[PDB]
Write a protein that binds this ligand. Structure first.
Ligand code: HEM
Ligand code: HEM
Ligand code: JZ3
Ligand code: JZ3
Ligand code: JZ3
Ligand code: CL
Ligand code: CL
Ligand code: CL
Ligand code: CL
Ligand code: CL
Ligand code: CL
Ligand code: NA
Ligand code: NA
Lengths: 481, 481, 481, 481
């Protein structure tokens, strides 16, 4: 048994009735419990994430099967058997909190590893590529895909306008409009790092790496019809599924694989290996097994742990570095930037975001300082040998720059259509039919000029792809061939 | 033709490429356009409303048919033909911003009248009563109805626990579980002030008043099955429907009626006329036509106008005053309170919230001061005849207090069951079948003890109601009768 | 030895140099440590208190000498020898952080008692009365006294405009323009609760109470000349003094006394005993010793503990209640209100604000949720016996209301001038001279009409006081006499 | 004559009395005017600037005397006679908003030019160099100089610890401990850009440029004793002086001069021309007159204009670019960053901050959206020829990068002591005496080892400097010599 109390620790005598002039009269201002309780209610909500607002979290463990020390000095990957606690959030992308989990979208796949050398965030999606290759375009891309700013309804005429005029999107669209654009749930779903990262070993040698998560539960996707049926009865089916699996003891798991490429292979390829619109051939750069992640624990409070969770691709640990990918480069900034807004200057003290590794630095103050700070010395250099010092063992590498000037210029070898054509041709006939069906339903009402340009981009990827789409939309494209 | 610019008004040379070390190198910190564009994008979102997060807005006009000067000095009601501009937001209640408009819930019906004596907000719902009668219970009621704080899914076991232990909810539930708990859209929907207010005329005479909005399009509802069919294909059907009606010139309208009651009828009744769990008899207190509101204009920007709209029941105008309704009394506080959090201290300067009537006072400063203030004098009293002064013509009435002590006590004659029974009996057989169906689907999984208490509360309302529900749920209630 | 780390727990390899293109080139965006460090630095500051911005804090203990159980059931006062931890903040009033502590002003004297029945804040000042008697005037009073909104300099012509037109200020100004308007430091200074409160014993019997703190170090003040001498060399002399006393083991202390008055004495006094412009006679209501507060510990971190401290007069504990004082009644609302803005919705979880008594309630979420919440049940009533419940032993009293209407009306017996005259006459000749000197220096540059009305108010208090001031200012008052 | 109104535009009937239970009872919650008025009062304050919190603003005009088109394509400098409106804020640095203007500190000298090609901020100080040369050290430097985080008093032992271990500070300290560390006021004060910037002309040719403002009122400094004598009687003397000059029509003015250096002079020098701890010789790089700025208009409201003013060194206009100065590079980020926190995401819409040039871009939403946005198209590229487009005529230059790796490394030729010695020797004997006097008063109580290292740094600058200081401090340095 417990007393209901105010926030001052005073027990509440009556949690039913406001304080009033007799039994039916108007209310008094001197009702601290009423005002405190309403005022805190009135302040429950914080801004939702600007994208990936709808999602679900769980905790688990990552266990290494094969040490990666030949390629990275990352502590959490150093030894067979080594276990690292994770927190993972899965999500949709475009619509707000409360939106259905039956909509076409990439799905987020964000993993926070609580390592002995700091938190490592691998902030992935299910699909292995992206629509754009420079962060400068992200707000434009997002705005195009978001509900129209007048109507509050998503409009394919808007996002296809953007995408058609951004032909580097063609590969991504060739995946997103497969039925893998609507995963069945968060467990039966792929995971990808998307970007090339740099792995640096004990000798200082660097390789490029890509990360892949393969679900133990296999990949299951929904057709448009299957998605509609689920939407009719449950707008939160994936959130429900994840919680329920774990509550029943049916823990979902993913194997982690990497591809590795020498830096020197840039020069021989017909694409830029750090263009995130590109994959790497699994023939030429085979998947290498790293380990397994198992999610086995629901959070205790959805708001405090899942809603407040903060991931950033710049949360890198020794041995794992950013590549020069210009999309990634902007992410390094945007995540901690948004999070200071969404969660507060001290968001890294919120429990789910705290490292297991010790934190010692000269930062101070900010809204909601809860950490009981002490001491006179908040500056370095200082004369005190016991105060925190820099540690040169933990310097990052020094990537070689191939450019000579500060420029705003597209990467060389953009090669916008080739891989989209390869993906198309890798599709089974059924999968090619689903792709065309899903494209057609999406494009059939868009502006004719934008429609034609979409067809043209897909035709440039593969003639049979473009032509099939034209046939299905009833567009004759002979005069242009 | 126009230049794309920074916020400093500098034209942007390249909105495609970040600034980098050659065409494929990493990105530079000296890229003001990138950082400004991403930093603003990173800050687009503000907290959603704590309830009624999902909604849609329109502008229109209200026109008086019958002047109401005999009963209220309210300027906007003073002459036949008098037109007042309005802004209206409709909404659901419980789920977040992107949630479906096919869920069971009261619907919000919030009308802002831009009058010559200030803005008047009549913050209504479709249903004419409420679940509770004291604001002190609102955060509890809401928390019970909201998604579970661990799972992020609404749980009938939690809200029926609260409602069954809060038997004054029995009338509301008798309406909410009719098919009117899912209006077909926002146009074919009832509107109600819910609370009793006080109207005061120019002689200082007071009457109790209730407000009712009657849709020109008629009232139409959805069965559970009809709602699921809509949900399968559109999770923003009501938002879509409202925008489309107005865009095509098919403007939805409502007629405004009032009921009027003398304060001296309190002892005539077997309920408290200011208990918002109660309606008033239309036989004994007939509906009196006031005028008609037509919605004829969509907003230009959903975020700036609909999302940032701020209504409060305390935005009262001379001649229209609060009643003593303890639920209403807390609303007077909570709305401006939550708005200062959600929107900023200066939220009343956001265009949609601005009065048409002049504003002049001694308030100053606060985040985002955009109004070009001037002058030395920001205090009253002062020696300057030209500075703003109080105007005693605009004093509010002085309601008589019947109580002689500051108390926390339930009203007398709560009468929790009788009107629920009267409503039940007023239903057609088809409507009674829908009600029992809807209740049964909602109750069939809840804790048995809570299920029995639900049945008991409805049985106390009407024996046939309670027994039918018991029969439909398979609960034998013989031992209690 | 300790590593300097990022907030992610990664050790820092170089805390001297930004990451750049060669040893002298421009900076890269991929410098997480730079950006994290700068971004936190960029967010150190929170809004200063709207008043009392300049101040200093210490911890200590309060020990009861005489148990007060005959007059209040307050747990912390229930037994001889009972010790309660305190946190105290002293302050000036009008000027910002960084302003000198040699300015004329009331001094704040805010004491937070960490009791077994919750936190109790007694938010006092040194001087025992106030300028105004209704909270509606507070922002006007403050705006008049604050630096002019154009010039950013305080202007006596502004505040004397307000004060002269607010004659209830006359008693306060007769204290504030004694040399007690500049205490020598925070230790050699009076403390006062200012308002009448209600004390309620275990039989439910109520008395009016006033609180007084008497410094063990004596009361010492500064002339205008002595203040200027200090100001030349130290603008934080009182903060310095407090810290230095405690660091040296010279702990300052104050004895707590109360005056007690029966509620029934209202009716035969020639002033309202709950008018905070009035004191109570120490002959007719003698001071009764309660106990002693000793300050013996400096905070570990000024920002986290002193700057973020939050006191409210509405933080009352069982047995101690507000009176009807209309000034106090607004304070009940304003403090938690401003603190939610200044510090966050969860400001009551900042360590210095946390009670020692357990907190258990159904509030949730809000910015910077750091408390590791758990459980499914965040609403009451609920079916669970183990969840927090109200406790009727802790209900507040039910004060009798003497009025029968909701009114806006000044109190009866305002008696604006009599106690100002009594205070004047109680001064020594030297003290009278200082008063007239201090007033003259303040008034000599104000608008002539305002200057005359000041003189008139002081003359109404005492004809010698007013005539001496008129003579000292060179104002001929013959035509009025 | 005007009515006092609420923010809803309703005239206030009584601005003196709260609404209460009779004339002397407690206050009612239903008092919208009370609550709105207090709640706005409660939210007046915003965070002060993290440095340069104390300051004062004025408006004026900058007129070109000599067109600079041969060296920069900057539009505001393109023609003799061309006039540009400015806003200027002057400041101290370390202490908070209300702190005295008599303290030793650089003084801020921030100029916003409202040009036809966007706002250009030149965010200078009076002194022409800085303490440090890499932004990564700025939070350390500041934290050392700021009041101790326990005591809230500045401690020379803390900042001398930092500075002695940061010997690049030696030049700066040799200026700051001259009497120029305390300017007499803001009019009789130097101004400096401090950094090297890049000027780029219409042919794309780049020169390095340094900016200097020369007061029409001449330079006047205060001794420590003169500063104390002013501090005794006025803590806002420089704010007062500036307002009062302009109010009287005695408008202060500064002539703007530049020095210009070819990029190729790098190897001609024994320092780095982009090391902000260095000046350039006026013999070798003579001052060239550009024009004159006159301040002639005080602001209408100090909060709205001066307090909410936002300047950033990254507010550059075509033809003026950042240099590679690593201090400046961090500033490019930190200002807008801090401003988003201090003022809100939309701070660029606060009137003082708004450009005169048109702003058109695809940014949207954020707290306090007041600008009446409209339209469907908030993304680029898009198919609409009338929507804003990039303009290649306004591309920035492409500076050449000399380094071939991403490094963290000190510049070559840091040369920490030579220019400090040159400055020392340039001082008159009276100025040298003041310097030694000021240093000795500052150093006499610091840790002996720190004190000796200070002496050593100054001795390395000039033997006579160091020896005189050692003598004055009573430190025997024979035996290090
Ligand atoms: C320039 C490109 C991108 C930018 C600028 C960007 C920016 C952001 C921002 C600001 C957030 C909100 C973070 C928060 O509020 O905590 C977010 C969320 C997210 N983004 Fe990105 N994003 C980009 C591309 C991508 C890519 C390529 C992926 C995956 C590879 C991705 C995956 C995610 C995920 C999974 C989340 C949700 C994190 C969570 O669960 O809390 N984004 N993004
Ligand atoms: C209606 C009249 C008054 C109002 C509306 C008012 C309002 C406020 C507010 C809003 C603050 C800032 C609190 C914070 O941010 O934590 C404050 C501080 C303060 N007020 Fe008042 N006040 C009033 C009268 C008085 C009176 C009568 C006293 C003493 C009896 C007083 C003593 C103080 C003190 C000591 C502080 C500083 C507390 C601290 O150390 O943080 N005030 N006041
Ligand atoms: C007030 O909202 C609700 C009522 C009944 C069932 C579901 C809800 O979301
Ligand atoms: C950065 O300015 C300072 C230098 C020396 C002493 C005090 C200061 O605030
Ligand atoms: C050249 O060495 C020194 C000079 C002055 C003070 C201390 C030293 O170590
Ligand atoms: Cl640090
Ligand atoms: Cl707030
Ligand atoms: Cl006002
Ligand atoms: Cl609660
Ligand atoms: Cl921010
Ligand atoms: Cl843009
Ligand atoms: Na009429
Ligand atoms: Na006793």
């Amino acid at each position: 048994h417990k007393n209901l109390t105010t926030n001052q620790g005073v027990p509440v005598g009556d949690n039913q009735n406001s304080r009033t002039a007799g039994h039916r009269g108007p209310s008094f201002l001197d009702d601290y419990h009423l005002i405190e309780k309403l005022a805190h209610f009135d302040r429950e909500r914080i801004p939702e994430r600007v994208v990936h607002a709808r999602g679900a979290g769980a905790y688990g463990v990552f266990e290494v099967e094969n040490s990666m020390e030949k390629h990275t000095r990352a502590a959490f990957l150093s030894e067979e058997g080594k276990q690292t606690d994770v927190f993972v959030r899965f999500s949709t992308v475009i619509h707000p909190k409360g939106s259905p989990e039956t909509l076409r979208d990439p799905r987020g796949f964000a993993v926070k590893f609580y390592t002995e050398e700091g938190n490592y965030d691998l902030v992935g999606n299910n699909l292995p590529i992206f629509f754009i290759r420079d962060a400068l375009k992200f707000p434009d891309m997002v705005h195009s895909l978001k509900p129209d700013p007048v109507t509050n309804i998503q409009d394919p005429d808007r996002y296809w306008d953007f995408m058609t005029l951004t032909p580097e999107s063609t590969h991504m669209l060739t995946w997103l409009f497969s039925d893998e654009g609507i995963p069945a749930n968060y467990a039966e779903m792929r995971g990808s790092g998307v970007h090339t990262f740099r792995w640096v070993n004990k000798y200082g040698e660097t390789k490029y790496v890509k990360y892949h998560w393969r679900p133990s539960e296999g990949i299951r996707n929904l057709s448009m019809e299957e998605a509609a049926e689920i939407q009719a009865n449950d707008f939160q089916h994936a959130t429900r599924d994840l919680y329920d699996r774990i509550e029943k003891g049916n823990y979902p798991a993913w194997d982690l694989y990497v591809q590795l490429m020498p830096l020197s292979d840039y020069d021989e390829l017909d694409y830029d290996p750090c263009d995130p619109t590109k994959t790497w051939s699994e023939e030429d750069y085979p998947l290498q097994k790293v380990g397994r992640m198992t999610l086995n624990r629901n959070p205790e409070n959805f708001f405090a742990e899942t809603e407040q969770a903060a991931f950033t691709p710049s949360a890198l640990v020794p041995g794992i570095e950013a590549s020069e990918d210009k999309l990634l480069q902007g992410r390094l900034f945007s995540y901690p930037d948004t999070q200071r807004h969404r969660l507060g200057a001290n968001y890294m003290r919120i429990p789910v975001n705290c490292p297991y590794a010790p934190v010692h630095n000269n930062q101070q103050d900010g809204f909601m300082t809860t950490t009981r700070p002490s001491g006179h010395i908040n500056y370095e250099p200082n004369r005190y040998d016991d105060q925190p010092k820099e540690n040169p063992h933990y310097k990052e590498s020094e990537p070689v720059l191939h450019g000579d000037r500060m420029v705003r210029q597209k990467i060389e070898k953009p090669n916008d259509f080739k891989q989209a054509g390869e993906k198309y041709r890798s599709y089974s006939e059924e999968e090619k039919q689903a792709l065309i069906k899903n494209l057609t339903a999406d494009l059939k009402g868009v502006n004719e000029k934008t429609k034609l340009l979409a067809i043209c981009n897909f035709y440039r990827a593969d003639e049979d792809y473009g032509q099939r789409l034209a046939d299905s939309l009833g567009v004759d494209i002979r005069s242009y061939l």
